[PDB]
């Protein structure tokens, strides 16, 4: 079965671009990463940083996750991210998203050995 670590890279890493240069980015990436296969995932964040820089966050600022868990980590630095939010015209299977390019700190949950990101918690 897909590992939690592999799922994180599939749902949230986009190292091949510096930013979302098109307002269509979310519509394309949500579909291409199979986040719209069974239903329209309502929100998703893509990180435009090297995998190594994102994995490194697991050894940065320990913080409580939104749900109270204590295996969350906040990036010391802001990162290039793209927020994807479902629009009012979204209708499975034609999922539609609003694309928002931003520069923010990311908060991820980490697990395992090697200790890596398995969940995207928030951007602050």
From Swiss-Prot:
<feature type="active site" description="Proton donor">
    <location>
        <position position="119"/>
    </location>
</feature>
<feature type="glycosylation site" description="N-linked (Glc) (glycation) lysine; in vitro">
    <location>
        <position position="7"/>
    </location>
</feature>
<feature type="binding site">
    <location>
        <position position="10"/>
    </location>
    <ligand>
        <name>substrate</name>
    </ligand>
</feature>
<feature type="disulfide bond">
    <location>
        <begin position="26"/>
        <end position="84"/>
    </location>
</feature>
<feature type="binding site">
    <location>
        <begin position="41"/>
        <end position="45"/>
    </location>
    <ligand>
        <name>substrate</name>
    </ligand>
</feature>
<dbReference type="GO" id="GO:0004522">
    <property type="term" value="F:ribonuclease A activity"/>
</dbReference>
<keyword id="KW-0456">Lyase</keyword>
<keyword id="KW-0325">Glycoprotein</keyword>
<keyword id="KW-1015">Disulfide bond</keyword>
<dbReference type="GO" id="GO:0003676">
    <property type="term" value="F:nucleic acid binding"/>
</dbReference>
<keyword id="KW-0540">Nuclease</keyword>
<keyword id="KW-0732">Signal</keyword>
<protein>
    <recommendedName>
        <fullName>Ribonuclease pancreatic</fullName>
        <ecNumber>4.6.1.18</ecNumber>
    </recommendedName>
</protein>
<feature type="active site" description="Proton acceptor">
    <location>
        <position position="12"/>
    </location>
</feature>
<feature type="binding site">
    <location>
        <position position="85"/>
    </location>
    <ligand>
        <name>substrate</name>
    </ligand>
</feature>
<comment type="function">
    <text>Endonuclease that catalyzes the cleavage of RNA on the 3' side of pyrimidine nucleotides. Acts on single-stranded and double-stranded RNA.</text>
</comment>
<feature type="binding site">
    <location>
        <position position="66"/>
    </location>
    <ligand>
        <name>substrate</name>
    </ligand>
</feature>
<keyword id="KW-0971">Glycation</keyword>
<dbReference type="GO" id="GO:0016829">
    <property type="term" value="F:lyase activity"/>
</dbReference>
<keyword id="KW-0255">Endonuclease</keyword>
<dbReference type="GO" id="GO:0050830">
    <property type="term" value="P:defense response to Gram-positive bacterium"/>
</dbReference>
<feature type="binding site">
    <location>
        <position position="7"/>
    </location>
    <ligand>
        <name>substrate</name>
    </ligand>
</feature>
<feature type="glycosylation site" description="N-linked (Glc) (glycation) lysine; in vitro">
    <location>
        <position position="37"/>
    </location>
</feature>
<feature type="glycosylation site" description="N-linked (GlcNAc...) asparagine; partial">
    <location>
        <position position="34"/>
    </location>
</feature>
<feature type="glycosylation site" description="N-linked (Glc) (glycation) lysine; in vitro">
    <location>
        <position position="1"/>
    </location>
</feature>
<feature type="disulfide bond">
    <location>
        <begin position="40"/>
        <end position="95"/>
    </location>
</feature>
<feature type="disulfide bond">
    <location>
        <begin position="65"/>
        <end position="72"/>
    </location>
</feature>
<comment type="subunit">
    <text>Interacts with and forms tight 1:1 complexes with RNH1. Dimerization of two such complexes may occur. Interaction with RNH1 inhibits this protein. Monomer.</text>
</comment>
<feature type="glycosylation site" description="N-linked (Glc) (glycation) lysine; in vitro">
    <location>
        <position position="41"/>
    </location>
</feature>
<feature type="disulfide bond">
    <location>
        <begin position="58"/>
        <end position="110"/>
    </location>
</feature>
<dbReference type="GO" id="GO:0004540">
    <property type="term" value="F:RNA nuclease activity"/>
</dbReference>
<keyword id="KW-0378">Hydrolase</keyword>
<keyword id="KW-0964">Secreted</keyword>
<dbReference type="GO" id="GO:0005576">
    <property type="term" value="C:extracellular region"/>
</dbReference>
<comment type="similarity">
    <text>Belongs to the pancreatic ribonuclease family.</text>
</comment>
């Amino acid at each position: 079965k897909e590992t939690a670590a592999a799922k994180f890279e599939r749902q949230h890493m986009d190292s091949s671009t510096s930013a979302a240069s098109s307002s269509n980015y979310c519509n394309q990436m949500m579909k291409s990463r199979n986040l719209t296969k069974d239903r329209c995932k309502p929100v998703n964040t893509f990180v435009h940083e090297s995998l190594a820089d994102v994995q490194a966050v697991c050894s940065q600022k320990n913080v409580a996750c939104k749900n109270g868990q204590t295996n969350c980590y906040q990036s010391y630095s802001t990162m290039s991210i793209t927020d994807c939010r479902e629009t009012g015209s979204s209708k499975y299977p034609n999922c539609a998203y609003k694309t928002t390019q931003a520069n923010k700190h990311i908060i991820v949950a980490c697990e395992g050995n090697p200790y890596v990101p398995v969940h995207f918690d928030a951007s602050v």
